[PDB]
Symmetry: C13
Subunit: 96 residues, 13 copies
Amino acid sequence: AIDVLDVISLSLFKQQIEFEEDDRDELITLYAQAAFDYCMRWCDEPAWKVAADIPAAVKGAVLLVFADMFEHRTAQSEVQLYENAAAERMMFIHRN
Amino acid sequence: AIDVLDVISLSLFKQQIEFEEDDRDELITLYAQAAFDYCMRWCDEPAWKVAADIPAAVKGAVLLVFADMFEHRTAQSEVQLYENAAAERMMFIHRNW
Amino acid sequence: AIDVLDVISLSLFKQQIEFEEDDRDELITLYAQAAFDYCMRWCDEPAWKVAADIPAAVKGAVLLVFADMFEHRTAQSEVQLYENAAAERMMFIHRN
Amino acid sequence: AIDVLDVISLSLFKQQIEFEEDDRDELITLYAQAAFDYCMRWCDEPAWKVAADIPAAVKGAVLLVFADMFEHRTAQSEVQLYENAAAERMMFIHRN
Amino acid sequence: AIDVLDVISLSLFKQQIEFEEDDRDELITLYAQAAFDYCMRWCDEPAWKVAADIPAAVKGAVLLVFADMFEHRTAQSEVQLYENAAAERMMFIHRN
Amino acid sequence: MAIDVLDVISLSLFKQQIEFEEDDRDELITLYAQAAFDYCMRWCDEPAWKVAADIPAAVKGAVLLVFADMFEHRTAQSEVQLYENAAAERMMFIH
Amino acid sequence: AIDVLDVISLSLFKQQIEFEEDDRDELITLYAQAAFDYCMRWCDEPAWKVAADIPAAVKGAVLLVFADMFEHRTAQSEVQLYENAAAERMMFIHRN
Amino acid sequence: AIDVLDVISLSLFKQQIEFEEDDRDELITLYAQAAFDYCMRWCDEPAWKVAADIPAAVKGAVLLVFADMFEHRTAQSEVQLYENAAAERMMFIHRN
Amino acid sequence: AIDVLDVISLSLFKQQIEFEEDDRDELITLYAQAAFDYCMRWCDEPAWKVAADIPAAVKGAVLLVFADMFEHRTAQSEVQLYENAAAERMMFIHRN
Amino acid sequence: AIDVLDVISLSLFKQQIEFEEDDRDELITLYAQAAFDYCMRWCDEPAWKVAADIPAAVKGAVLLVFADMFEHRTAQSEVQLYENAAAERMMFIHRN
Amino acid sequence: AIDVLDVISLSLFKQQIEFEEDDRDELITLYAQAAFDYCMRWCDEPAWKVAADIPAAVKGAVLLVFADMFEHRTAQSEVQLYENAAAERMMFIHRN
Amino acid sequence: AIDVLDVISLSLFKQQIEFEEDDRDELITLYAQAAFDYCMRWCDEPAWKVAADIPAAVKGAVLLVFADMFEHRTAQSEVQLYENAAAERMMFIHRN
Amino acid sequence: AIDVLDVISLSLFKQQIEFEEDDRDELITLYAQAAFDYCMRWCDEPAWKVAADIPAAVKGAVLLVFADMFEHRTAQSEVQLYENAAAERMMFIHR
Ligand SMILES: [Cl-]
Ligand SMILES: [Cl-]
C-alpha cells in the first residue's frame, strides 16, 4: 500500500489546517491516513501503484477530506454542515 | 475479539476530544468501546481478525462516533443535532455487502 | 435477570451526567434501571444471559436513555425535544 | 389496587421535581396516585398484582407523568406544550 | 349527586392554584363544582355512586380543568390558549 | 317564568370573576350578567331547566366566562385579534 | 319605533365607554341610536313593541356596536380591525 | 334634494373628527356633502323625502365615510388602508 | 367644457393638501385640471354641462386624485403605493 | 410635431421635481422630451395636432414620467421600483 | 455610422451620472458608445441616419443604459439588480 | 489573433475597477485577456479581424466580465452572486 | 505533461489570493497543480501540448478553482457555498 506521507508531506497537511505545532503529529497522521484511504477506495483505481501515480486533483480532495476531520470531530453536530462540492468534483474527474 | 485500545490508543481518543484530564479514563474507554463495537457491526467484515487489520477510514469513523458520545450525552436534546456525513461515508467504503 | 449496576456501575452513570453529589443515588438508580429495562426489551436478545454479555454499543445506548431521564423530568415540556439518533442506532445493530 | 407509594416512595417523588418543602404532601400524593392510575390503565397488565411487579421502565413513565402534573397545572396554557416521547416509549414497551 | 369537596378538599383545590387567601372560597368552590360536573359528564360513568368511587386519574383531570377556570377568566382572549393534552388523556382512560 | 341570572350566580361572584372591587358599577355589571345568561340559556336550549337550582355547575362556569368577556372586551371590533377560549363552549356542549 | 334611551340610559352608555365628560351627549346619543337601529333591523323581530321587550343579549350587542362607533371613527383605517364575534353571537340567538 | 347639514349639523361633523377650529368649515362641508351623496346613492331609497326620514344607522355610516375623507386625503397611499366593516353594514341594513 | 375651478375653488384644493403658500398656483391648477379630466372621462356623464351639475361624491373623488398627484410625483417609486378604495367607490355611484 | 415645452413649460417641470437651480435646463429638457414622446406614442392619438389639444390628464402622466427619469437614472437598480398606477390610468382614458 | 456624442454631448452624459471630473472622459465615452450601440441595435431602425433623427424616448433609454454601466461595473454582483422597466419601455415604443 | 490591449488599453481597464496602483499589471492583463477570450468565443464573429472591428457593446461586455474577475476571485463563495444581465445582453446583440 | 507553473507562475497565484507571505509555497503549489489538473481534464483538449497553448479563459478558470481551494479548506463547511458561474463558463467556452 501507499503511505499517504509519501504523497503529501506531514508539513503540508499541517499547512492545510494552519497548525504550526508538532505535538499532534500522531493524530494528524491518523486523519491523513483516513482521508487518503477514503479517497483511494472512492476512486477505486487499481493502476496507481506508487505515490507518484496519484493525480494532483486527488491530492486536493485528500486535503479537503483531511481538513474536514481535523475541524469537525463528532458524528453529529449542533451546527448544520454543508457538502463542499469541490471534494467530489476533484475525485469524480478520476474515478474508475 | 479486538480491543479498541489496540487499534486507537486512549491518548489518541483524548486528543480527538481535546480532553487533558485523567479522571475520566473509564468513561472515555466505554465510549471508545461503544463506538468501535458500533462501527464493527455496521461494517460487518469477518476478515478483520486483529487490530492491525482495521483500515484507516474505519479508524476515522470510530473517532467521530466516539467524540459524538462524549459531547452529546442524552437520547433527546433541546437543540437539534445534524448528521455529519463523514462518519457513514468513512464506513461505507469498508462495508461487507 | 441482569442488574444494570453489574453492566454499568453507578459511578459511570453519575459521570455520564456530570453529577457530583452523593444524595441522589436512589433516584439515579431508578433512572438507570428504567433505561436498562427499556433498552433490553427493545433489543429483545435472550442470548445476553449475564452482565458481561451486553455489547458495548448497547451500554452506550443505556447511558443516553438514562441521561435523558435525568435531564428531562416531565412527560410534556414547553421546549421541543429532538431525538438524538445515536441511541436508536446503537441499539438497532444488536436487535434480535 | 396497588398503593403508588409502595412502588415509588414519596421522597423519590419529591426528588423527581426537586421539591424540598414538606407542606404539600397531600397534593403531591394526589399527583402520584393520578400518574400511577393513568400508567396502569394505559399498560393494561393484570399480571401486576403487587408493588414489586411494576417494571422499572413503567416506574420511569410514572415519574414523567407525575412531574408533568406538578409543573403544568391547567387544562389550557398560554405556551404550547410538546409531548416528550420517552414517557410513552417507556410504557409502550410493557403494554399488554 | 357527589359533592366535589368530598372527592377533593377545598384546601387541596387552593394548593393546586397556589392560592393563599380564604376570601375567594365561594368562587373557588364554583370553579371546583364546574370542573367536577364537566369531567363527570365527559366520563359518563354511572357506576360511580359515591366520592370514593372516583379514580385518581379523574381527580387529576378535575384539578387541571379547575385551575384553567381560575387562571383563564374570559370566553375570548387576546392570547391564544393551547389545549394541555393531559386533561383529556387522564379522562379518556376512564371513559364509558 | 324565566330564570333570573342573579338567582343562579350572585353579583358578588360576578365581581370576583373579574376582580372588580368597586361598588359604583352594579347596574352595568348586572346588564353584562343578564346578557351572558340570556346567551348561554338560548345556546344550551334546555327547557328542562325550570328553576335556578336546575342549572348545572359547568353551565354556570360558561356564564362567568361569557360575562367576563363582555366586561373586558367592550367593542364589536378590536385592533387586536381575539381568540375563542374553548372552555366556554365545551362547558355548554356537555348540556 | 323604540327610543334607545328608554332601553339603555345615556349614563350607562357613557359607563360602557368609560367616558366621564358631559360635552358630547349629542354625538354619543347619535352613536347609541345608530347602534340600536342596526341591531333592531338585523334581528328583525316584530314582537318587540316597547323598550321593555328588548332582551338582555340584544342590549349587550347594542352596547358593543355603540362602543365600536365611539372608538373607531373612519370607514377605513391604517390598522386592521378584527370582528369581535360576541356582537353577532349575542344578536343571532334572537334573530327572527 | 336633502341638505346633509339638516340631518347632521356641522358641529356634530366636527366632533366626529375631534376638529376644534373654524377655518375649514367649507372643506368639511364638502366632505359631509360627498359622504351623504355617497351613502344616499348606495342606499337608493326613494322614500326618504326629508332630513327627518334618514334612519340612525345611515347617519352612522355618513359619519364614518365623512371622517375617512377628512383623515385620508389621497387616492393612493404608502400605507395600506383597511376597510372598516361597520360602514357598509350600517348602510346595507337600509339598502333598497 | 367645465373649468374645474368653478366646481372646486383653488383655495379648497390648497386646503385639501394643507398647502399654505401661493407660489405653486400654476402647478396646483394643473393637478386639479388633470384630476377633473380623469374623473370626468371615467364617469362619462354627458348630462353634466355646467359646474353646478357635478355631484358632491364626484367632487370628493376629484379631491382624492388631485391630492395623490401633489403628493406622489413619479411614475415609479421605491415604496409601493396602495389604492385608496374611496376614489373609485365615489365615482362608481355616478358612472354613466 | 408638438414641442413638449409648448404643452408644459420648463418652469413647471422643475416644480414637479422641486428643483431650484438653473444649470440643468438641457438635461431636464431631454427628460421632458423623452417623457412626452413616450406618452404621445403610448396614447397614439394623432388627432392631437397642437399643444392646446393635449388633455389635462395626459399632461399629468407626462409630469409623472418626467419625474421618474429625473429621480431614477439607471437601467437597473439595487432597490426594486414599483409602478405608480396613476401614470398609466391617466393615459389609458385617452388612448386611441 | 452615428457618433453618440453628436446625439448626446459628453457633458450631458456626465450630468446624467452627476460626475464633475474630467479625468474619466475616455471611460465615460466608452460607456456612452456601448449604451448607444446597444439601444440602436435593439431598436434596429434603418430610417435613422443622422444624429437629429434619434427620437427623444430613445435618448432617454440610452442615458439609462449608460448610467447603469457607470454604476454597475461587474458581470456578477453580491446584490440583486432589478430591471428599471422605464429603459425597455422607452425603447419598445420605437422598435422596428 | 487580436490583442485585447489594442481594443481597450490597460489604463482603461484599471479605471473600470478604480485601481490606481502599478504593481498588479500582469494579473490585471490576465483578467483582461480572459475576459476578451470569453466574449470573443461567445459572440463567435469571424468578420472581426482587427482591434478596430470590435463593436462598442462588446467592449462594454468585456469590461463587465473583466471587472467581475477582478472582484470575485473564487469558484465558490459564501455569498450568492447574481448575474448582471447587462453583460449577456450587450453580447447577444452581436452574437453570430 | 504540462506544469501549471509554466502556465501561471506561483507569483500570480499568490496575487490572485492577495497572499503576501513566503511560507505556504508548497501548499499553494499543490492547490495550483490540483486546479490545473481539474480544469485540463474538464476541457479535455489534448491539442494543447505546451504552456503557451492554454487559452486565457482557461487560465482564468484555473485561478478561480485555485483560489477556492485556498479559501475553503474543508470537504464540509458550516456556511453554505454557492457556485460562482464564471468558473464553468470560462472552461465551457473551450471544451
Ligand atoms: Cl419653457
Ligand atoms: Cl513559479
